[PDB]
Amino acid sequence: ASKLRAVLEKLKLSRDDISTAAGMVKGVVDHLLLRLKCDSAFRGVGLLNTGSYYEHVKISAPNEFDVMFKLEVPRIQLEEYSNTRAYYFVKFKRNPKENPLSQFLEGEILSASKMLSKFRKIIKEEINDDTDVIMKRKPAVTLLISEKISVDITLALESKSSWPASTQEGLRIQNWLSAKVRKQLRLKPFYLVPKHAKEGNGFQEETWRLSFSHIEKEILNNHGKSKTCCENKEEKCCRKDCLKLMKYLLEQLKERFKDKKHLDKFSSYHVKTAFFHVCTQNPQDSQWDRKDLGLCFDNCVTYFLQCLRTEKLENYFIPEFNLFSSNLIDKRSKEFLTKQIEYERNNEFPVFDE
């Protein structure tokens, strides 16, 4: 744990870079926020608060930022595509009056691809008009600011409805954060992003993915069984430090296997998800004591290793959606990273050496 305390101390040394870059991202996003609102389709648009350290700007990696644009979409009806559990067609209840988004209708359903293609069109126009920002390739739109800072921009529909039934069994925080907290969180809105399902070797370009990204800050910064966890000197846990270490381990591993880019498909979303599953299995604050940093880290890596070997990682909100399914990440990649992480844990993480 001496080695892990050192790693965490070094990471603090790059707060300024992160914080000034974030501010750079914050400017651009506010620019874009103005233009979208001129559009009859996007005037109910606004920034969704999804960050644990910065309000509108979540950090997905050392020079990678994630920002979400919510759009209030009333009277929304869902029909689940096949049995994906996470992907849905979007309809409306009736025609109360003909809504603004009607331009992206195809029959009764709302076209993920059409709405996305106008979102992307508006953002690129403003991108030309002083910081040097461009667009990148490929659920998201992507910017490159000053050639060093990457920003992912995700349009989300905001539904204030009851969560779909696939989430009935997710958010298994009861023995940890209590059943009351799960009830309060399940009363917040949920979000639908235009991530297209993978069918055949193409995509179904009218499906929307459910998104609970905004719940992370709600739990990350209110993370203990005790309501006052980490609010006083007598209640320090290492929950946040293990999450940082988990992310950093994957960042470092992806940087070294960059030659053949084997770890292309893994991201801190997987890491977060396995982390919170471990919080579910270890619900007591006494299980995350700060002097146990080493053993708590090994818990998290072990569980991550289990997911990789069994090729199974449940969406934290949708237990029947397998983030490590073969439809998403091929078998060679999962096999590969099992081997790398097996090694790292069996040899005391030499990837953290100096």
Ligand SMILES: Cc1ccc(-c2cc(C(=O)O)c3c(c2)ncn3CCCNS(C)(=O)=O)c(Cl)c1
């Ligand atoms: C307790 C708790 C709370 C929130 C999350 C959470 C949820 C989502 C999500 O479901 O949106 C997250 C997320 C964290 N980081 C990113 N995303 C986006 C979805 C990835 N897919 S994507 C890029 O859109 O193709 C987790 Cl893991 C645990």
Ligand SMILES: [Zn+2]
């Ligand atoms: Zn704590």
